[model samples]
Target: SMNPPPPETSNPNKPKRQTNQLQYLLRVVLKTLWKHQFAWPFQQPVDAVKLNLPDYYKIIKTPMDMGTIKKRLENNYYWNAQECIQDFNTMFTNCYIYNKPGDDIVLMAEALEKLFLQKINELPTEE
Candidate 1:
């Protein structure tokens, strides 16, 4: 059988440019952190074998990283803002656990997380 025609765009119930506001705003904030120089450490998953941290997987039960978060966002995996925040927090907390308080990577995680908080707080509210 021939493929059905796609839904028409003239329907009154659906509005144009009506994409999910929260999702759009969250992406903007994520892009800010994704481009930050301090975000490099958290940009990819930890290499437990190559980095010689054999116990990394044992300690961090659920490891979070920028790439993982990016994929989640792109895939519409998150249902709300708090979910995104929790992922970011988890990523930072993992760094704190694996690295010393004074370690460079830990410090970078701190700085990047600080910026993330600020950006999220700065998101615009709907009128």
Candidate 2:
């Protein structure tokens, strides 16, 4: 969006017009995971692999390390607390991780948490 300065005047003495870009580095991977666009869900019906857990569980575990999490993600998994935080870190593209890390991370976490909690309440009791 262009916010070009108010038309400038010939008053060479006129101070330079300033504009704020407000460019952002934000993460959307949380939404992507929550939506399961890759054809997986937090839970899956009886299947051959018989992993005995939610499909989305893959993303949910943590060593808080790249090598471990990346490898785990190849299949789908994360632990409870530490894993989730690490996975959260891996969710964004580098560009979205500029100076806005802490703020944007919190926002995305809230969005995904709301998604998970909302979905949890809505799921059926039986397998």
Candidate 3:
């Protein structure tokens, strides 16, 4: 029998856009934080690493410190939340062109925001 032909490859001449996993993840997280209006989830502390609680109800909760959150984000890019949000939105919107798998982007974003909020909120308040 003759050898079978190899599978066809995509056209190399076409414009190629690549997906940055880390950047996409960051953008989604920023979007979720903004959509939620920076509100800390009232039900739980949001820190799964330290709390290790099975449910939100079992976790202790606290108010989010806006300053710390701002600082953390700023430290990453030397930009404020508003600026970061805008940039993230722009990148996220363009991400569709790459045809990357959209696996729980919203959920992952929410989870990241929650985790960070929890970590920051746990810190002792300054005098």
Candidate 4:
């Protein structure tokens, strides 16, 4: 079975620049979601609290991996070469800092489902 990509790089110099950018955007979106959609009561006090980008990246990274795994299973691929490609694609998509997390989350979920279905349909069937 193919394993997921390594978590965001730890180097201070490089520090997974893309991941950092994405995480920063996610923090903003998450805060907005908490305040508006979720109506989190803690938003007032927590608004002053700054999110640690690296830590947030770490927090969300696992779920991103699981999303890929879930996609693979949904495709009925069951741990194969295609799973590797899906894993990479999922990582890249998740690391993107979309304007709206809720919207992007829905879009991405649907997109992944479509891609997985397409790949599965294209695969040669056994005799």
Candidate 5:
């Protein structure tokens, strides 16, 4: 529904560059934020944490076929695709670093934690 953002400024004479890499990462983050709106609607109530998630999720590397990725995607030659996927993986499966044992992130997990606990007894339990 939206187009990708323009490329960032080129900072030359540095060890590396931010021309595309920074733009790519920003795109990822912005896209993640966009996904949170509907996945976990601001006023929509989720009866059960476990039941609400599991629709569409983030893109990652592992448990996904490399050949399929190469064949399916056009820009398969990303410089930081691997690291991005690693972060994506952590966002969902591993939340210990974020103090969130919940498996929710920006899309699947993002809405997972956009959750708010109302009462001391109002626990959002999962299966």
Candidate 6:
């Protein structure tokens, strides 16, 4: 339910420069999440045929994965930290929706989500 923060001041000398220190830190955090033992389920987009869950698309309207989030961060798609936060929330929310409460994948989502929130808050808010 949050919106992106106000536009940042432009850099005249490095007009095309996209990433800042914050973005780089965020990227590192994403890599850490990807390395988690239970990260395989969320590493890439779900394959309905391989997973044998044909109803996946019908239930998950806006799918998200680590790879997608990494791409967004690499491409400078997020204008602010809130955007990245929301995507992580969406990723966890999708896991909760598609899987049962006792599912290991859901537990992984919970654990990783907790770690993500903790690590993100540890990041410096201001440049």
- Top-scoring candidate (TM-score): 6
User: Could you give the candidate ranking by TM-score, starting with the highest?
Assistant: 6, 1, 4, 5, 2, 3
lDDT of 6 by residue, 3-105 (tens): 2232222333422334454474456678778888888887777776677787877788777777777766665666666666777788899889999999988
* Candidate 6 least-lDDT 10 residues: 1-10
Q: Which digits, one per residue and each the tens of the lDDT, describe model 3 over residues 21-113?
A: 223324444334545632433112233345443442232222222233333343453223344344333333322332245645444434544
Error of 6 at 33 (Å): 0.7
Q: What are the per-model C-alpha RMSD values against the true structure? A: 10.9, 22.5, 18.7, 15.6, 17.2, 7.9
The total of clashing pairs for model 5 equals 4
Give the per-residue Cα lDDT of candidate 1 at 80.
61
Taking all chains together, each candidate's TM-score versus the true structure is: 0.76, 0.26, 0.22, 0.27, 0.26, 0.77
- Root-mean-square deviation of Cα positions for candidate 6 versus the true structure, in angstroms: 7.9
Tally clashing residue pairs in candidate 1.
Answer: 0
Displacement of the residue 48 alpha carbon in candidate 3, Å:
33
Higher TM-score: candidate 3 or 6?
A: 6
Q: How much lDDT does candidate 2 score?
A: 0.32
Residue 127, model 2: Cα distance from true site in angstroms: 3.9
User: In model 1, which regions exceed 4 Å deviation?
Assistant: 1-26, 125-127
| TM-score of candidate 6 to 2 decimals | 0.77
Task: Name the lDDT value of residue 106 in candidate 3.
Answer: 43
Instruction: Count the clashes in each prediction.
Output: 0, 10, 0, 0, 4, 0
In model 6, what is the error at residue 100, expressed in angstroms?
Answer: 0.6
TM-score of 5: 0.26
After the best TM-score superposition of candidate 1, give how far the Cα of residue 46 lies from its true spot, in angstroms.
1.1
